[PDB]
Design a protein around this ligand. Structure first.
Ligand SMILES: [Zn+2]
Length: 25
């Protein structure tokens, strides 16, 4: 979830895909 992302510059439009796209476990 982009809302619960760890690194900044991820939440630009509340897009989950744009977050998990590069953000992984
Ligand atoms: Zn992220």
């Amino acid at each position: 979830f982009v809302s619960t992302c760890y690194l900044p510059k991820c939440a630009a439009a509340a897009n989950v895909a744009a977050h998990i796209t590069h953000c992984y476990k």
